[PDB]
Every structure is written in C-alpha cells, then in structure tokens.
Design a protein around this motif. Structure first.
Motif, mmCIF file in Angstrom:
data_model
loop_
_atom_site.group_PDB
_atom_site.id
_atom_site.type_symbol
_atom_site.label_atom_id
_atom_site.label_comp_id
_atom_site.label_asym_id
_atom_site.label_seq_id
_atom_site.Cartn_x
_atom_site.Cartn_y
_atom_site.Cartn_z
ATOM 1 N N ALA A 193 0.321 -1.655 0.287
ATOM 2 C CA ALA A 193 -0.295 -0.234 0.284
ATOM 3 C C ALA A 193 0.560 1.432 0.299
ATOM 4 N N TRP A 202 -8.479 -6.665 3.028
ATOM 5 C CA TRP A 202 -9.386 -5.427 3.117
ATOM 6 C C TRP A 202 -8.669 -4.296 2.461
ATOM 7 N N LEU A 203 -7.434 -3.936 3.120
ATOM 8 C CA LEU A 203 -6.921 -2.730 2.074
ATOM 9 C C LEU A 203 -5.837 -2.881 1.200
ATOM 10 N N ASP A 204 -5.827 -3.706 0.725
ATOM 11 C CA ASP A 204 -4.728 -3.943 -0.017
ATOM 12 C C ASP A 204 -4.565 -4.783 -1.683
#
Ligand code: NA
Ligand code: NA
Ligand code: NA
Ligand code: NA
Ligand code: NA
Ligand code: NA
Ligand code: NA
Ligand code: NA
Ligand code: NA
Ligand code: NA
Ligand code: NA
Ligand code: NA
Ligand code: NA
Ligand code: NA
Lengths: 220, 220
Positions: free
Chosen positions: B62, B74-76
C-alpha cells in the motif's frame, strides 16, 4: 487564519548554489525522508538541482509515526467533510511552503518542479495549477486528481504534467491515471504518461528513469 | 526452505554490554526506524537495555517505501491465502531474527521483551508464545491476536503480556484489546491492560509510561 510550518529535509545542490528545485511530496502515512532518498540516483544527473521533501502537517490517522496531508475516509473512518477541510488546509500549508523554499533558494517558479507519490500527487495536482505563476512541471506517481470538475475554472497556471502509474496498482486504480490525464489535457495542460507495466503501488526503475528525463528537460 | 534476513537498527546499551534486549516490531507500511525512536525516552530508565527494530521482510503493498510483515486483504487487495502464507513466512523470519539477536547479544530468552505496534503486535503475539523458552514479556500496542482459537494448542511458552490500546482507534477496533486479552488470559497468560483514553491509532505518553513500568519490572 494560520498556516502550519512544514519540516523538511534537503539534498543536492549546495545551499546558495541551486539552479533549480525539486519538491518531493510523500504519500499517506509516510514522511519526507522516504521520497527524498530518490535524490541519490537523480542528483548526479541533475547537477544544480536542490531536492526538498516536506513532512505533511498532520499525524497519520492510520499509523504510529507517519504523516498525512489529509485523511482518507474509506480507510481511516474520517468524514468526507474532514477530508475536504484537511485538503484545503494542507494546500494552504504547501503553498506557503513552496513560497518559502523559492524565497530562500532565490529561485523563480519556473525553476521548481513537484514530484509526488500517491496522496502527494493529489497535493501536487491541486496546488500547482492554482499558483499564480507556472512552475517547471509536475511528476505525479501513482496518484489521482481530486477535483477534476473544478480544474477548468480554478487553474490559474498550467505547467506540464507527467503521470506515472503501475498497471497492477492494488490501492490506487490504474484507471485514475487516464482519468487524471484527460482532465488535465482537456484543461490545456501539456500531459504525458508512462505506464509501469506489472508494477503495483510503488516506483519502479522505469518510472524513475522517465521522471528523470522529464525533469532534466524541464529544469533550467 | 529459506528465511529472509532482516535488516535492523540498534540503540541503547553498548554492544557487548547488554543485560537485556527489547525488540520493536513496527506496523504495516512502516519501518524499524520509527518505533526504534522510542528508545530515546526509554533508554535512561532502562540502563543496560539494548533496543533493536527489524524491518519487516516484504515491501508494503500500500505504500512506496515502507514494509509489511504480511498483506492486509481489506486494504491492499491481497487474497486471504496470501495473507495467511505471508504471516507464516514472516513468523519464520522473525523467529530466526530473535535467535540471531539473542545469540549475538549473548542473552537468554528471559532477557528479551517484544514491543509491538499494530501489525507488529500481531507478530509478537504469534511468535513469542510459540518459542520453546519463555521470554520476559510482550507489550502490544494497538493491535490484535490473529488466531485466538489456535493459541491454546500451540502456545509452548506463556510470557506476561501488556496490551495497550486507544479507545478511539479508527483502524484497529478498541474491542480487539479485550478479545485478545481474554484469549490470552484463558490460555494461562498473565495479562495486563492499559486504555489510552481519547487516543486513536498511535502511542500516547500514558501508553509509553505504562510500557516502561512493565518493562522495567520484567527485564533483568
Ligand atoms: Na511538517
Ligand atoms: Na512517499
Ligand atoms: Na497515499
Ligand atoms: Na522526514
Ligand atoms: Na488515529
Ligand atoms: Na499519478
Ligand atoms: Na483521477
Ligand atoms: Na528486513
Ligand atoms: Na510502527
Ligand atoms: Na498495522
Ligand atoms: Na528502518
Ligand atoms: Na503494491
Ligand atoms: Na495490542
Ligand atoms: Na483480537
């Protein structure tokens, strides 16, 4: 109201001796020091260039020791209003910072380029066009244009822009490169692109190479 | 298979002269250097302590210049399998790193403490219990316990744990502190807590203060 003073690091051309200035703008949760490291491979090919990298003015909502230009609602729970107000305040601060650097380095706006990464690219694309005088150019890595619809009206200056983006970027969609590109081109910006093929959210050697060529050509 | 060697910084007690060892474990997208800075206020109160902070073995999905112990779906955009495999590989690497530090510092496992932040806390809580010998303790800031259900079976050692968490943490839910706490307590770990009231995802002075007291008491 009041501007927050930005801390920054410097590299490159000896103070007093700079023909040009490159300001690195880091991404969310990072700091100046990371991007400023790009000054190492670049400096020998940009002899009279001074490199500076400010830290964004706010602690990062999502990490322990990094900085943010403004918050990112989908990621850190901030509100859209907080994000918008944050961007306006960060732009105020960065504008003042650029004035200060140009003043102290004894340079004109055409010898300044901005080099952004991600959120830092969003900052570059917001601030630079809104300056009174046209800077040498912008290199935007792996970022996007926050308010394309406003660009038309509010752009006071139109420096050339090179956008560089990894086509496998998992956090800032590769499509944002074309979106940002066409908003800029249609607003009268001379716009260039380089695709980092197979690259994610980061700066690959080919991206650095093209940024160097772009800077070397634009900086006095 | 093969372990990745971790780069690290050091502070504190003169090499050869360490009575104890604190390993800082940074969070996602960060690096060792950030947390290692906590050695400054801590050192004078922990005279014979050496502080070390490894960099996580993988580039962060990220950001541009930071590191990750493993990815965060969930983020990257990573897959759950990639996250799980990443954690296993990171644990392999950190285990080897701890062995190396203890070997070179000439210390026994009871003079080693881990101090984690966020993802680094997840690493501490995974690796430490699985060591053959019990270390002095773990301070986990602003993190969570990844596989609570496995803790029972796989814990081979049970060092004391202090969990510290901001009750306004916008990225790692404050509830994870209690969840991690009870999994640990029920598995036979002597478990302590400190709530950083009004604090988000970061280390406030009261959190550092309690961590110091905890370390000062546990380290020889
Ligand atoms: Na600053
Ligand atoms: Na950056
Ligand atoms: Na960013
Ligand atoms: Na910095
Ligand atoms: Na926070
Ligand atoms: Na870009
Ligand atoms: Na865009
Ligand atoms: Na490493
Ligand atoms: Na950290
Ligand atoms: Na983290
Ligand atoms: Na480091
Ligand atoms: Na990436
Ligand atoms: Na924790
Ligand atoms: Na938990």
């Amino acid at each position: 109201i009041m501007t927050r003073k930005l801390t920054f690091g410097r590299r490159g051309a000896a103070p007093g001796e700079a023909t040009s200035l490159v300001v690195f703008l880091h991404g969310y949760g990072a700091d100046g020091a990371d991007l400023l490291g790009l000054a190492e491979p670049l400096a020998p090919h940009l002899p009279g260039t001074a490199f500076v990298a400010p830290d964004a003015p706010e602690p990062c909502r999502a990490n322990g020791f990094g900085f943010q230009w403004f918050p990112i609602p989908w990621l850190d729970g901030s509100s859209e209003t907080a994000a918008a107000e944050g961007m306006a305040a960060a732009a105020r601060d960065l504008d003042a910072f650029l004035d200060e650097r140009l003043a102290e380095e004894g340079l004109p706006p055409e010898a300044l380029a901005l080099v952004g990464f991600s959120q830092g690219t969003m900052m570059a694309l917001h601030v630079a066009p809104r300056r009174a005088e046209e800077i040498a150019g912008i290199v935007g890595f792996s970022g996007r244009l926050l308010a394309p619809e406003r660009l038309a009206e509010e752009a006071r200056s139109k420096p050339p822009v090179l956008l560089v983006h990894g086509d496998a970027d998992p956090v800032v969609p590769f499509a944002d490169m074309s979106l940002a590109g066409e908003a800029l081109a249609e607003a009268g910006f001379t716009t260039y692109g380089h695709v980092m093929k197979g690259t994610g959210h980061g700066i690959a050697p080919d991206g650095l190479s093209v940024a160097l060529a772009f800077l070397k050509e634009r900086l006095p």
